[PDB]
Each structure stands twice: as C-alpha cells, then as structure tokens.
C-alpha cells in the first residue's frame, strides 16, 4: 500500500461488511476514517482479522437486524456474486430477495449513509446479459442513490498482477455530487522479481517435474505483461510457468493444478509457487499484516481479497468530492 498525506476522511465513520481479510479497512483507515462495525463468518478469516485489528467481526449477516447497526457515513462491501431469478414486471429491489445482496439493500434503506462503496468480479457487468448489474443499479437508484461503475486493472495502479475487478460507488442524491471521478492509470515500475523473498526461506515450494517443456527462454527485459515461459502436464490451468520479469497472473482462491492457486514461476533455475508473504505483496498488503499460520488458508484468503492500492486511490477521491461544498 502507499501513504496518503492528506487524510481526506478524518472524522468519517464506516462499516466493513463481508470483511474477509480487512482490505477495505486497511485502505479507509489510512485516509482517516474510523471503523464502527465488521461482519464475516469464516472462522479463519475472523482469526486473522483479530490478529491484526485486535477485534473479531460479528456473524452471519443474514441474521443481523438492520435497526441494530451503528450510524455510519460510508458502507463498504465486497459481497459474493449470485444470479437473480427475475420473475415479474421489469427489475428492482424485489428481485434481490434470496441473495446476499438483498442484505445490503435491507441495511441501506434503513440506516444513514452518505456512500455505498462496493466491489466484485471482472464480469459482473455481463452476467445474465447484463441482468445482474441492471438489478443492483435500479435498486440503488430507487433508494435515492446515484450509480457509478468501472473495471480497473491493478497493473495500472502500481501493482504487478493482472486483476480486473468492477468497482461501484454510490452517492446519496441528497448530497448533490456531480464532482466524482475514478483515478487515472500510470506507469508500472515494479515487477515480480522485486517482490520475492530470498531462496533460503522458499526451498519448500520447489516442484521438480520431468514433463516440463520450455516453449520460450528467459527474456532480458521486464514488461507489464504476462509472459508464459513453459508448461507441464497438458498445459492447462495450474500447469503453466511464468517469468519473474513480468506480471503475476491472477491469483485464485479455488483453482487446481500442479501449481494450484499462485501459478508457477521460474525463479533461479527451479520451478516454484509463491509464498504467502509474496501473495500478500502482490495484493498490496504491507509487510506488517500478520498472515494465517496455515499456508493453504493464506492462499484461499488472498485470492478472494482486494487490491489495497486501488482502494486507496478511489477512497481519497471520495473525501475530495465530499469536501467540496462552496458558497
Ligand atoms: C449469511 S450467509 C449466506 C445466506 C444466503 N442467504 C443463503 O441463501 O444461503 C453469509 C454469506 O456471506 C458470505 N461471505 C462472507 N464474507 C464474504 C465476502 N467478503 N465476500 C463475499 N461473500 C462473503 C459467506 O460465504 C456466506 O455465504
């Protein structure tokens, strides 16, 4: 993550829904905001969340009563995508019933807040011929909110990894805000080689394979692209080797293969996976964020997580718009 010297959010209060590892929390707390709530049911996530943020989030959202949630200015949420079974006249609020989204709407209609800050998968914009996005959109509009959405790729913001994700920002219509804008992309000057740990701490991740077939040889120059160097097995997912002088492929929580979630990399004449500190680093997490003792957990977590840096630029630009109220 990077440091923000202009705390455009001091004094503002927020809730961290579907917490996971606490990305949105790391991000907003650096802009000055304060955390008033958190919710997350996966006992392992709650375990890491507590190791860093000292507290344990509450449980199953489906069961928390709306009128029970603290007063807040910003609602943060990276919920899980699910299809909507639209069975009726046109689209809106009533169709979000049965999904965990309805739980967001349920809390927004009855408690504050100035802005709803969400995030999801790269293809949220296309799911069901656009139907999935059409619903969340019409729902926010009909509760008196404005809707802005965009797909930003993390390599365009100082992080070496291919990872497109839709970011969605909603401003209460009461605020009258025609002033918002998503950050501008820039030059990348950090690649996978700069994020690795020394060999001594990564020996146990080397995988020796005789069916390794090299298609290209190591490039001499770094590029902001994904460079496939070789293969193993059938060359399907999880069995492809990448160059450290490039960008990391998209980390995944539930993938399989020989090099399962991190992908495999040619580091120093040996083929290995990424270590969890590396995974953290590839997501933007600071070296001070204590990770889960179980390396198979760290993987599932960091792959369902958030790119901190991107969250920090978008949040700053939110303090801005809310702080510009001239006579
Ligand atoms: C309250 S239960 C889901 C109940 C759902 N109504 C039902 O029909 O099955 C809470 C859900 O939150 C999901 N969840 C927790 N943290 C999340 C996050 N950061 N992003 C996405 N989904 C998350 C859990 O995996 C679980 O499915």
Curated annotation (Swiss-Prot):
The keyword Plastid does not apply. InterPro entries: C5-MTase (IPR050750), C5_DNA_meth_AS (IPR018117), C5_MeTfrase (IPR001525), C5_meth_CS (IPR031303), SAM-dependent_MTases_sf (IPR029063). It holds the Pfam family DNA_methylase. The active site is at 81. It comes from Haemophilus parahaemolyticus. This is Type II methyltransferase M.HhaI. PROSITE patterns: C5_MTASE_1, C5_MTASE_2, SAM_MT_C5. Its EC number is 2.1.1.37. GO terms for biological process: DNA restriction-modification system; methylation. The gene is hhaIM. Disulfide bonds: none annotated.
